[PDB]
Amino acid sequence: IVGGQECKDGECPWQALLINEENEGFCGGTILSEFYILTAAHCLYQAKRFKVRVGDRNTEQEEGGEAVHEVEVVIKHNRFTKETYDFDIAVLRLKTPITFRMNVAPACLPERDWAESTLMTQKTGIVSGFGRTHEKGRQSTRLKMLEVPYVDRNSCKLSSSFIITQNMFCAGYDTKQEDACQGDSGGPHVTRFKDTYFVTGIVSWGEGCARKGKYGIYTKVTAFLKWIDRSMKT
Amino acid sequence: RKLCSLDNGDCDQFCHEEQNSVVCSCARGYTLADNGKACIPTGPYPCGKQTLE
Ligand SMILES: CNCCN1C[C@H]2C[C@@H](C1)CN(C(=O)[C@H](C)N1CC[C@H](NS(=O)(=O)c3ccc4cc(Cl)ccc4c3)C1=O)C2
Numbered sequence: 001i002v003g004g005q006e007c008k009d010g011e012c013p014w015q016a017l018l019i020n021e022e023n024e025g026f027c028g029g030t031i032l033s034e035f036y037i038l039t040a041a042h043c044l045y046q047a048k049r050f051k052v053r054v055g056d057r058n059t060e061q062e063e064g065g066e067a068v069h070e071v072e073v074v075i076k077h078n079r080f081t082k083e084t085y086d087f088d089i090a091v092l093r094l095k096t097p098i099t100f101r102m103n104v105a106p107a108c109l110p111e112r113d114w115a116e117s118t119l120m121t122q123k124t125g126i127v128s129g130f131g132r133t134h135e136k137g138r139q140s141t142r143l144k145m146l147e148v149p150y151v152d153r154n155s156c157k158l159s160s161s162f163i164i165t166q167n168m169f170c171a172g173y174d175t176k177q178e179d180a181c182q183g184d185s186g187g188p189h190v191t192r193f194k195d196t197y198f199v200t201g202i203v204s205w206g207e208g209c210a211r212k213g214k215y216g217i218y219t220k221v222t223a224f225l226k227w228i229d230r231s232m233k234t
Numbered sequence: 235r236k237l238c239s240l241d242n243g244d245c246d247q248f249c250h251e252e253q254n255s256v257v258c259s260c261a262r263g264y265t266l267a268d269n270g271k272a273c274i275p276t277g278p279y280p281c282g283k284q285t286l287e
């Protein structure tokens with residue numbers, strides 16, 4: 001995350017981190033329930049074996065709420081394609097259930113019509129992660145969050161060198177130096193409504209980070225609500 | 235602006251229109267209150283809430 005703020009105690013409890021064999025984060029996720037994590041399909045080709053860590057805000061100290069979970073089943077969307085990042089979504093079932101506590105809780109799944117008419121028409125959403133704090137920098141040891149404006153669909157298509165499918169949406173700023181970045185992929189994009197936070201997107205891709213005339217591209221979660229429901233039953 | 239377009243139809247969470255009237259509902263893990271508008275958490279650590287303890 002470039003710009004933004006630290007997630008303070010209890011502020012981002014749905015954040016998950018995919019960690020490799022060296023215990024290093026390489027992608028984010030969103031806690032959906034005690035057994036399921038939402039992430040990006042493209043993240044599944046960036047490590048041989050991985051686990052999921054929750055309840056962490058500082059990777060350099062033990063805070064008391066951290067928990068590592070092994071993955072039982074990987075459920076990647078069968079129409080995902082590396083060429084365009086269309087259908088960039090996957091769900092993970094964990095071997096053991098997440099025990100909710102301070103800094104560990106799920107984000108809510110909204111209904112499609114209401115989320116598209118009411119949540120995606122709000123001024124901003126919130127993106128979070130342990131990714132780079134600038135395009136060529138190192139990964140953050142602190143979990144960060146950032147308010148990102150929803151961007152007009154036509155404006156986004158005009159700004160982009162690459163295709164924006166029906167399964168994607170844009171958020172962020174034209175020139176202001178705030179955006180998601182490398183390592184934030186697969187993480188949460190949530191929208192606040194009457195003090196309740198609903199999942200609205202998955203960090204997907206961008207032409208660099210916080211570049212002038214470019215926005216952040218997110219997987220459109222609302223187009224995948226039926227798919228998510230099915231994946232969470234088997 | 236009428237029904238659901240008018241301040242979310244007074245609903246805490248989901249709003250839908252049926253036969254010229256507002257129907258409110260809630261996310262999984264919440265139950266609709268007696269007034270048919272507010273959403274009440276069924277158990278500890280409900281979805282979408284920042285944690286306080
Ligand atoms: C290689 N470029 C060819 C076009 N590209 C092919 C694939 C599908 C899309 C179009 C997205 N892909 C990309 O490579 C895009 C264009 N890029 C360029 C580098 C950048 N990586 S990153 O680590 O800086 C990054 C990752 C995720 C991000 C998410 C948001 Cl919301 C904002 C910025 C991000 C930056 C990337 O994804 C793969």
Ligand SMILES: [Ca+2]
Nearest residue numbers: 058061062063
């Ligand atoms: Ca820690």
